[PDB]
């Protein structure tokens, strides 16, 4: 044989709440849009933001 | 992931209105007035009793 593949569920989050006025996820589908220091286009939908 | 929510608190509530106050208010103004009025009076009819 040989491997190869990678793929992903999207159910959705596993729910908590902070109350921190920075804490933001999506309820279903959506992603957000992230920029590097030299601006590269990235996607997530981890909601820690300071 | 696959998700069943539980539950949150949606704040606090409180049994207040802002119309049956006013009324109290007023009712309070004109009560208030005439009471004492009154009781000064009484107090000079006091002093004609005897």
Redo the contacts between chains.
């Keep these: 044989v040989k491997v190869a593949g990678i793929t992903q569920?999207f159910?959705?989050?596993?729910?908590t709440?902070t109350g921190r006025g920075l804490d933001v996820a999506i309820s279903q589908n959506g992603f957000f849009r992230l920029v590097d220091s030299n601006g590269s286009v990235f996607y997530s939908r981890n909601g820690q933001f300071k | 992931g696959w998700i069943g929510n539980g539950v949150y608190v949606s704040g606090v509530q409180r049994e207040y209105d802002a119309f049956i106050t006013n009324q109290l208010r007023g009712a309070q103004n004109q009560s208030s007035g005439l009471t004492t009025r009154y009781e000064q009076m009484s107090k000079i009819d006091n002093l004609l009793a005897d």
């Design positions: 569920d159910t959705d989050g596993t729910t709440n």
